[PDB]
């Protein structure tokens, strides 16, 4: 299924697997525009450390209410918020401590559900998780390719990584140039 890693972009890598167009990129994702950005979260939905505090204090003060009320209402392995002021339609919120190829596995599918053709995520359970980066980076590209391989991808055309540090922008390069 995999397409030739390139660089659109200075410190920008991408590549095809199947149909859907795989970008990884090291900086800000609040920055980002797409229709599903993730939140890497803990499994009271509260976080506010790192990526996640970005994403909540840029999102606002409706999308942190919307979290908290959500969580107590069921036991919830993810939650679809709107996007309040990040420039998306829903944030998905996915626990950072859960297996990350599940956890991609259901963004792709919710992204379907809506018809959703871009979805923008950080390095899944690098931050307050402590999920190894070589381990998250195998888990991501496994579940778009098991997505792909299912012959699932209708809508969803772009998964783009936005990753908090240089460092593990690099580990998801190697594992890209590993499956070329
Ligand atoms: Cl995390
Ligand atoms: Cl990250």
């Known amino acids: 299924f995999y397409g030739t890693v390139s660089s659109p972009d200075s410190g920008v890598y991408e590549m095809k697997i199947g149909s859907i167009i795989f970008q990884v990129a090291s900086g800000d994702?609040?920055?980002?525009?797409?229709?599903?950005?993730?939140?890497?979260?803990?499994?009271?939905?509260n976080l506010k450390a790192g990526v996640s505090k970005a994403i909540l204090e840029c999102a606002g003060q409706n999308v942190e209410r919307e979290c908290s009320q959500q969580a107590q209402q069921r036991k919830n392995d993810?939650?679809?918020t709107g996007?309040?002021?990040?420039?998306?339609?829903?944030?998905?919120?996915?626990?950072?401590?859960?297996?990350?190829?599940?956890?991609?596995?259901?963004?792709?599918?919710?992204?379907?559900?809506?018809?959703?053709?871009?979805?923008?995520?950080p390095a899944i359970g690098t931050g307050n998780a402590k999920q190894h980066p070589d381990k998250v980076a195998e888990a991501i590209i496994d579940a778009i390719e098991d997505f792909?391989?299912?012959?699932?991808?209708?809508?969803?055309?772009?998964?783009?990584?936005?990753?908090?540090?240089?460092?593990?922008?690099?580990?998801?390069?190697?594992?890209?140039?590993?499956?070329?």
């Open 29 to 45: 994702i609040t920055k980002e525009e797409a229709d599903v950005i993730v939140n890497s979260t803990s499994n009271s939905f």
């Open 78 to 80: 993810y939650i679809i």
């Open 83 to 121: 996007g309040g002021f990040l420039r998306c339609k829903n944030i998905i919120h996915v626990i950072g401590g859960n297996d990350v190829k599940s956890s991609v596995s259901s963004v792709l599918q919710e992204c379907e559900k809506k018809n959703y053709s871009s979805i923008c995520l």
């Open 148 to 180: 792909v391989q299912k012959g699932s991808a209708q809508s969803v055309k772009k998964v783009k990584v936005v990753i908090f540090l240089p460092q593990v922008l690099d580990v998801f390069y190697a594992n890209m140039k590993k499956r070329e």
